[PDB]
Amino acid sequence: ESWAQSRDEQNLLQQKRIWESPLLLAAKENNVQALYKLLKFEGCEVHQKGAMGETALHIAALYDNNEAAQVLMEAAPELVFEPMTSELYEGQTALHIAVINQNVNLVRALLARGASVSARATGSVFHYRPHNLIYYGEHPLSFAACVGSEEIVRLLIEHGADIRAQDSLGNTVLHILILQPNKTFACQMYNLLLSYDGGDHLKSLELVPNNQGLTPFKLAGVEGNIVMFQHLMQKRKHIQWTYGPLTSTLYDLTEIDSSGDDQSLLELIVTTKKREARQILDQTPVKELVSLKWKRYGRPYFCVLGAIYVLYIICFTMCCVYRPLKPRITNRTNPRDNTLLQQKLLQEAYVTPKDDLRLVGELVSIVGAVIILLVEIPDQTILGGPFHVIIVTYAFMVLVTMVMRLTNSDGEVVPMSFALVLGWCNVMAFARGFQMLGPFTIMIQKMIFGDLMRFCWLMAVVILGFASAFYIIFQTEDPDELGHFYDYPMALFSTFELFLTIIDGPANYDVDLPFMYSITYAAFAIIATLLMLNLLIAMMGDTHWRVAHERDELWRAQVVATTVMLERKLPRCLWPRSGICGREYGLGDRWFLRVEDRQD
Amino acid sequence: ESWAQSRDEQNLLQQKRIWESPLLLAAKENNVQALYKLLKFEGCEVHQKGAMGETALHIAALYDNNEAAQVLMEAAPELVFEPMTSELYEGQTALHIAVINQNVNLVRALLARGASVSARATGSVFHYRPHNLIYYGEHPLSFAACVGSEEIVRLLIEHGADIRAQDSLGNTVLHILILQPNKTFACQMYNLLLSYDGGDHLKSLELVPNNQGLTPFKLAGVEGNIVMFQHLMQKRKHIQWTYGPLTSTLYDLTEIDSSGDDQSLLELIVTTKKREARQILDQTPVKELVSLKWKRYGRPYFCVLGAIYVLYIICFTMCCVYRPLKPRITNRTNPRDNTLLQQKLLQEAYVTPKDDLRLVGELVSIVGAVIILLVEIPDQTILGGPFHVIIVTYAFMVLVTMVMRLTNSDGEVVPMSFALVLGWCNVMAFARGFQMLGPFTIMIQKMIFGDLMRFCWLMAVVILGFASAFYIIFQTEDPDELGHFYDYPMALFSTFELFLTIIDGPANYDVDLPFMYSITYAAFAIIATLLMLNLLIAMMGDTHWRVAHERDELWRAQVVATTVMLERKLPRCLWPRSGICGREYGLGDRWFLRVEDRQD
Ligand SMILES: NCCOB(c1ccccc1)c1ccc(Br)cc1
Ligand SMILES: NCCOB(c1ccccc1)c1ccc(Br)cc1
Numbered sequence A, B: 001e002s003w004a005q006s007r008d009e010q011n012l013l014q015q016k017r018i019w020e021s022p023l024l025l026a027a028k029e030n031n032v033q034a035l036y037k038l039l040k041f042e043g044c045e046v047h048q049k050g051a052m053g054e055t056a057l058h059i060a061a062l063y064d065n066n067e068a069a070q071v072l073m074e075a076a077p078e079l080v081f082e083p084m085t086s087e088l089y090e091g092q093t094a095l096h097i098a099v100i101n102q103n104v105n106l107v108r109a110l111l112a113r114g115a116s117v118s119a120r121a122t123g124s125v126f127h128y129r130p131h132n133l134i135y136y137g138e139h140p141l142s143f144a145a146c147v148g149s150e151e152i153v154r155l156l157i158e159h160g161a162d163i164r165a166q167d168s169l170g171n172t173v174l175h176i177l178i179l180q181p182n183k184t185f186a187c188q189m190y191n192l193l194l195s196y197d198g199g200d201h202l203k204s205l206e207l208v209p210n211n212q213g214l215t216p217f218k219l220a221g222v223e224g225n226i227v228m229f230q231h232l233m234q235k236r237k238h239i240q241w242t243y244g245p246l247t248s249t250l251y252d253l254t255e256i257d258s259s260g261d262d263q264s265l266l267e268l269i270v271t272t273k274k275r276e277a278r279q280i281l282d283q284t285p286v287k288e289l290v291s292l293k294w295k296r297y298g299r300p301y302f303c304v305l306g307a308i309y310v311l312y313i314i315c316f317t318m319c320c321v322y323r324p325l326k327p328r329i330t331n332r333t334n335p336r337d338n339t340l341l342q343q344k345l346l347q348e349a350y351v352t353p354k355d356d357l358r359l360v361g362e363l364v365s366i367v368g369a370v371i372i373l374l375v376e377i378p379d380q381t382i383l384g385g386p387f388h389v390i391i392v393t394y395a396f397m398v399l400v401t402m403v404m405r406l407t408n409s410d411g412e413v414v415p416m417s418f419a420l421v422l423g424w425c426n427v428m429a430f431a432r433g434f435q436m437l438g439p440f441t442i443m444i445q446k447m448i449f450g451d452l453m454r455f456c457w458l459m460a461v462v463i464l465g466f467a468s469a470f471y472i473i474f475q476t477e478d479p480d481e482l483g484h485f486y487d488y489p490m491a492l493f494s495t496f497e498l499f500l501t502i503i504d505g506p507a508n509y510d511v512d513l514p515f516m517y518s519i520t521y522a523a524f525a526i527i528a529t530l531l532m533l534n535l536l537i538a539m540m541g542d543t544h545w546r547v548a549h550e551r552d553e554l555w556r557a558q559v560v561a562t563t564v565m566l567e568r569k570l571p572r573c574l575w576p577r578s579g580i581c582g583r584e585y586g587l588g589d590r591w592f593l594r595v596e597d598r599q600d
């Protein structure tokens, strides 16, 4: 409490030691006449450590003081090898600070003194974290690549800088360039670093994987870096011919398609929470891949599953609507005359005239629940499919209904009634794709699990304020004639119904309503309308020109997400691999997709 | 009746004396040959006063007539010291008019004659009022600073102009520059006036406070002058280091943070009615201040108070829903058989089986009401918190319910029922902040106390037009079967319900409705819908792209308003002062907030 306070304090605690130490003060202010007055006559603490474990050279490198830095290296040339010792800066040398500041005349003078070109900077402030406004890696070659100083990147390779060197997160200098803001300038820097590769077709830096199993080409897709994704595609696409305006290009489709297994660029985009990566399946090598994946194979099998699931649910309801006998067969209708229960229990089973059709019906319904369960027990909380967490709980309710059966509980209706709504309402998950009702279900997915829960807690109040009042108002009145609030639980249910203007509202003209109801309900009506108009106006805002493109981009996104998931579960005798393979014609040996386009 | 007419008349009355007086006429028209024909042979009234107490030189200065002004000062050099004598222009000299017109060759010639550089212009038209299209102050140095003529500002200081001089409103020349339209040019003029300061660290013009206790840096925040607020920040922020793109700057945070007490820039912004100052807490020294004020300390304590207030209200309703016995215990059900009252009165108290839980419940509810009262009797009508004027009236209803108790009035329900709605609906004031339901409650705050009262008086009509009709229509009919309007008060209540389409509307098919109801209700339905559609379309307009930013700016504004108010009421053992202090490291001695940023 807190980490931000510590660095805020230690930045202030550093300036304290700078101001206190006359050596570090002159190194900060570039006082050449004061450094020699401290190092030569008399001899002071030349290896003086500051608050952050810094040296006088580390301070002289933070503020571009070349004159004050040459003084410290001509009087004591061992300060160059010294790294920062504090935890915030563990591993940083004076070369890192000069590279970050793009001090060319200092880096070219630091490498003449013999500085290390492989000094990791494992400090807590050099880590890949949101609280760090940057992430340039750990090696000084990566720092030169991130600042964009091409004069320093090649000047480091001149003195044995290794481009293959990875950091603590297994990232090469190519992986770090992908996570940078200046995308258009990093492409030129990405090519500058590729030229120093070994040059052989095997063991290439573009193939050196991240420690999370992610080549630089594959990392660009997950990160949503379109400028780098398009640039990394030039290395892996072959133009077949140029027939005037037409140009049929052949795409590599190696690391773009599965499998794999999870080492597939498509599976990484459909499973990530990055809102930027959703634009990658709209790129011209991939958009042709998934569009052909859905026109054939994709759309039919999804409709078959829906046609199967439509007939599967309509069979389950056929068992419910034809639920077993019988009437209440009990004098239970005498206690609490408000009871109209004719509870149907078992058994009373089977001895089947037309009842054996319901036996095979209950059998078909229960074998589908375990089939769903068997295919949905995966060894969670994701966008691309928020409806089929309900399909695994539907199979849970069927089993409970099966356990509610064979026990014959008076609560036989509650579990058998829950599966009716979850089963059907899950069929509009098949509206996804299909047609233009797909993005409409995207609207319902975005509201049910976001704008609802927040606005409910707003609408959860007010009601119980007026419901508690209406209870007190009509706790005094006789609930026989006009008793919308006879007890407290129904007082809230009747008030909730009245918030949505369903019931006519308590209206009785034979009797006289209490003096407080006619006053309390008028206010509840005006607030319930204003609270509902503001709910409709709050819908606006997610109606601009971009949100119609957003949900349409989200629709086709979750359609591609459904397409990739079907291919990774269905067998291989159906659904062939998209593209053509290169085996005599031996121009592979991988699978290629041929796409021609016309430049206007 | 009116003040605008007076100056309109006295401007016309002035031109009368100009046209009538041949001296003032020639001074207006720059008739050099006519001034000498009036002053030298013969000698006329050279000190002639006009309608506005002006002189011939005052008229010759209004219209840039240097040739006609030198005539009046070479023949009578005492007219320079003469000020305007009218009430509209009390205190204005011929130097003020030359400075306003930026007459450099006249001001440099007026100071050779020996004009006063400290002549206040206390006229009614020089005051800081909305009816005055400008406000340049009272001293001629301030006039030079407002017109932007740098050649005149320094030319006045050359002749002993005091920059420390304040006006009637305690404003320095620096305070007046903040209240100017040309913000981008006043910054250069603000620096020109700082250079003539004493130069010592103590008794500085930037510290000279307004007569309302407001330094020029603090006045810029309340006024919403962002260009000056950013410019005045350069004098009070220290850059710690520059590490390539990163640059951790240290902000002064002296006059920005409390306390104080009310001498705090944050407390001035959250309490002002200026729509412009709301943009100040979005500035880079302040936005980091309040964001860290709400991430920790702010948001938890506000949720604790809400969690306390949620449990406090749910306890109060537990006492209401379990209100005391008993039935009506009276033959009062015989008079007016429309009565279903079973009025519950006391006492009938206590002798507690499970009733002692309601005794401590009523005790917890009453001690919270006075606690609210004790902390809300402040020795009003503001935006940043329109819901908790209801929390002080809630505590008023609890006490009245306590006074309604111990008296056992038949109106026991009315005060006990009012506290149920005000207590709960005040909990959605805690929706402010929290999440995205905060700006939604901003919508409800902006509608309940603005668009409602105006539109109600529109919807207040029509209803009583049709309600009075429907009463007359069914004053003839028998209210037993279909009696929505049996008496006049319920005739308005039933018509109001029908305006919101709650009741089914009077529909009886066993009997025949009067020939006028079927005609009158059809018109009422069409108008009630058009009058409601136009109410929904009137919501649009406050739905553009800017109003979603407005209410979102208003949301975070009232969140900062809630954050500052909590800090100024909660003790000091919790909630530490935001930032770090400068006491060894002795670089203060005030509190500083360290903020680093990255320039792309
Ligand atoms: N059954 C689990 C979720 O359902 B689905 C789903 C899978 C196949 C066919 C239809 C729907 C899903 C949605 C998004 C992603 Br990404 C992955 C799967
Ligand atoms: N209780 C009086 C008003 O309530 B509030 C309020 C104060 C503390 C916690 C929650 C709400 C308020 C709102 C805006 C301003 Br600005 C100042 C106070």
Ligand SMILES: CC1NC(=O)NC1CCCCCC(=O)O
Pocket: A014, A052, A054, A058, A059, A061, A062, A089, A097, A125, A126, A132, A133, A134, B241, B243, B246
């Ligand atoms: C203490 C330090 N001394 C120095 O020469 N640089 C310091 C820190 C530099 C800022 C790096 C912060 C970041 O990258 O997040």
Ligand SMILES: CC1NC(=O)NC1CCCCCC(=O)O
Pocket: B014, B052, B054, B058, B059, B061, B062, B089, B097, B125, B126, B132, B133, B134
């Ligand atoms: C009567 C006057 N004679 C004159 O030379 N100026 C007059 C008035 C000037 C206008 C100032 C109005 C204002 O500042 O609001």
